[PDB]
């Protein structure tokens, strides 16, 4: 839950997709980072605040971004200046979500209890109540400052509250041009606390002394340029309007307001160790809309990194591409769709659907749709979750095709040793995952493109152990689909229906015949010395072993030769001539294998001898058993295995 920050974000995205009212994609971002910083502060250890401080700041930024995207878009045709409205959006997040010390404890009853008659600790208790009131007013606590000013006998501060309440009645209107020049002159008079000296300059739009700013934090530090522009833009337009008159004016005001970049050149220069933090400098880029300019700049200095930034920049583009179509750079979009799917490795199991909302071109083309062919191995949970998100047809025909064609180039080293052994454990451990993508795509129409993948690996077996026999067992783990591919094949029209349905049916008969010979050869070899002294059951079982084999040989010779001779698709004939030429000698030795173990019973001698001696004699009428010796090299092997019967049968 709390640990899976990415999962929470994904859920919010999913809800929006179901609905497809558009301003709800970013509003859910305020419920994630909040519960996280709350789960490390409600109960638990106190040292977790070293990580909760990162969550205590990532949530206030999502609040400031929600007011900027709705002002420049949701312009309803209801019943002027569009750039001055940004100052109001900056004041809402700069006033509501600010730090405020609570009310002071042990407030004195009467005044001057220790009594130039007051001690040094009396102006401090007066400045303590002065700072408690100088802070609440800066955060918009009129409702609280108005009661706070009346409560502490602090009547010296109430005279300006209504002056602000009179300035608030003039701001809602959108004379007082002379009242702005008196407080600035009051800020140049001596005799004021440091907290009250900064309060008079902040309301008008002036700069106070630097000794009061030293205490001021570099984050808060930004309200100085915000209040000056307001005091100057209203005096400019106010000046333009001139609704006070020249006489009402007293002193010249800096009515030349600067831009955002000239103000940011000074806030990150007063307290740069914290004003340029990676979670606070993102608010200037929302006014510039440059997405891949802050993350792709941390991949070059590899000689000398922050996961919270990659999750927000990538989540911004899915909204930036949606808020304004193509607002995110097209290069940045595909660079964000690729950096997200790659960084989402520890959490790639559930986000296999959230990457489709911004398909764009990385998904329509074989770009962002080929990475799923690298993790879908054994677990059946991720294979079924991708079935949602409204994706099928060609995407299913492009993920299954990219799953079997992308591993065919890696088996190129498996066709070089045509006369030696090799390391086939990886092929016997990675090709098993190469059959779950097609077995999961239970489509009777997309069966022709995958039914040939097993026959394409018969030549990688070569001598010694064969990989097709183990591959024949993977197909037995999911048969019956032959009935689904034969019924669905009569649904779509096809012209060459006299050769496409005959190759699939003949390959299934040879493979099932091959899987049967492998299991028949595993039961006679596992016999060894079975039945012990009671060979009566073996006298009939070995009789069945010797009959089922003498029949299997004549049957397997007729299945491979059933391909006739002259055919146009001779590429399928030159590949099956070796597999047929490789299943011949292994049968004659099994009857002779009853002359090493069943030789303790002089019964397989007169039988297994002539049974294998004529196996080459009748293998001379059907075109001399073709030339299985010409396709494998096993000629003298047959000459010696049978020649040995002249020192045992006599």
């Amino acid at each position, epitope marked *: 839950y709390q640990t899976e920050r990415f999962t929470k974000f994904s859920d919010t995205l999913k809800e929006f997709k179901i609905e497809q009212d558009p301003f709800n994609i970013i*509003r859910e971002f305020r419920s994630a980072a909040g519960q996280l910083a709350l789960d490390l502060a409600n109960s638990g250890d106190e040292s977790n605040v070293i990580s909760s401080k990162d969550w205590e700041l990532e949530a206030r930024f999502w609040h400031l971004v929600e007011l900027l995207l709705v002002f420049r878009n949701a312009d309803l045709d209801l019943d002027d200046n569009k750039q001055l409205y940004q100052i109001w959006i900056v004041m809402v997040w700069l006033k*509501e979500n600010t730090y405020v010390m*609570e009310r002071p404890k042990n407030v004195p009853t009467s005044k001057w209890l220790n009594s130039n008659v007051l001690d040094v600790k009396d102006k401090e208790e007066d400045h303590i109540f002065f700072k408690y009131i100088y802070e609440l007013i800066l955060a918009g606590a009129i*409702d609280e400052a108005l009661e706070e000013a009346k409560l502490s006998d602090n009547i010296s501060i109430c005279m300006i509250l209504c002056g602000i309440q009179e300035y608030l009645n003039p701001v809602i209107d959108t004379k007082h041009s002379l009242w702005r020049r008196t407080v600035y002159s009051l800020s140049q008079q001596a005799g004021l606390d440091p907290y009250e000296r900064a309060i008079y300059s902040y309301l008008s739009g002036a700069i106070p002394n630097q000794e009061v700013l030293q205490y001021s934090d570099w984050e808060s530090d930004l309200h100085i340029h915000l209040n000056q522009i307001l005091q100057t833009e209203i005096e400019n337009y106010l000046l333009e309007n001139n609704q006070v008159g020249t006489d009402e004016l007293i002193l010249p005001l800096p009515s030349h307001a600067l831009t955002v970049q000239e103000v940011l050149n000074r806030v990150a220069s007063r307290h740069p160790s914290e004003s340029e933090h990676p979670i606070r400098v993102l608010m200037a880029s929302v006014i510039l809309d440059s997405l891949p300019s802050v993350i792709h700049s941390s991949v070059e200095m590899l000689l000398d990194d922050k996961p919270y930034l990659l999750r927000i920049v990538t989540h911004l583009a899915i909204c930036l591409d949606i808020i304004n179509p193509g607002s995110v750079e097209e290069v940045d979009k595909s660079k964000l769709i690729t950096t997200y799917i790659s960084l989402l490795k520890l959490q790639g199991l559930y986000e296999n659907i959230p990457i489709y909302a911004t398909f764009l071109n990385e998904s329509d083309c074989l770009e962002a749709c080929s990475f799923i062919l690298s993790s879908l191995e054994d677990p059946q949970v991720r294979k079924k979750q991708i079935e949602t998100i409204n994706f099928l047809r060609l995407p299913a025909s492009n993920i299954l095709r990219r799953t079997t064609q992308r591993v065919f180039d890696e088996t190129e080293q498996e066709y070089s040793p045509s006369n030696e052994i090799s390391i086939s454990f990886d092929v016997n451990n990675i090709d098993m995952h190469l059959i779950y993508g097609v077995e999961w795509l239970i489509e009777g129409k997309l069966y022709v493109d995958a039914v040939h993948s097993i026959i394409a690996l018969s030549r990688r077996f070569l001598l010694n152990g064969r990989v097709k026999a183990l591959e024949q067992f993977m197909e037995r783990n999911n048969i019956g689909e032959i009935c689904k591919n034969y019924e669905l094949e009569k649904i779509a029209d096809n012209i060459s229906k006299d050769e496409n349905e005959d190759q699939f049916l003949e390959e299934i008969t040879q493979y099932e015949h091959l899987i049967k010979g492998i299991r028949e050869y595993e039961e006679w070899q596992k016999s060894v010395s079975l039945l012990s002294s009671e060979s009566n059951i073996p006298t009939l079982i070995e009789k069945l072993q010797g009959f089922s084999k003498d029949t299997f040989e004549l049957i397997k010779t007729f299945l491979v030769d059933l391909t006739s001779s002259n055919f146009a698709d001779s590429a399928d004939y030159e590949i099956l001539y070796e597999i047929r030429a490789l299943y011949t000698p292994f049968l004659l030795m099994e009857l002779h294998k009853k002359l090493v173990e069943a030789a303790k019973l002089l019964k397989i001698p007169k039988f297994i001898s002539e049974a294998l001696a004529f196996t080459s004699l009748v293998a001379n009428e059907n075109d001399k058993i073709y030339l299985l010796f010409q396709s494998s090299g096993k000629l003298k092997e047959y000459l010696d295995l049978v020649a040995r019967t002249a020192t045992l049968s006599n």
Partner: nanobody
Amino acid sequence: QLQLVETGGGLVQAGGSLRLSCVASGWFRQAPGKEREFVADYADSVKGRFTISRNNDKNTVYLQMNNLIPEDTAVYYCAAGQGTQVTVSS
């Protein structure tokens, strides 16, 4: 330790009324599963049915909810609160 005492929530029927009083010992909503959204400025889903009022110069907020529907069943929090449940049965 400034506190925010909220009261007035409860379970009503579709079409009933409620009065949420918030006294700042010193209005947003969250549905079951969704994110905290602002209710009261008035949200587009409560404009014309909910009314907000405040005592001039004080830190108190009252929200009168008339014509309540099943889309307003959630936990309401105060901001300037622990939460007060307001459910409406269909």
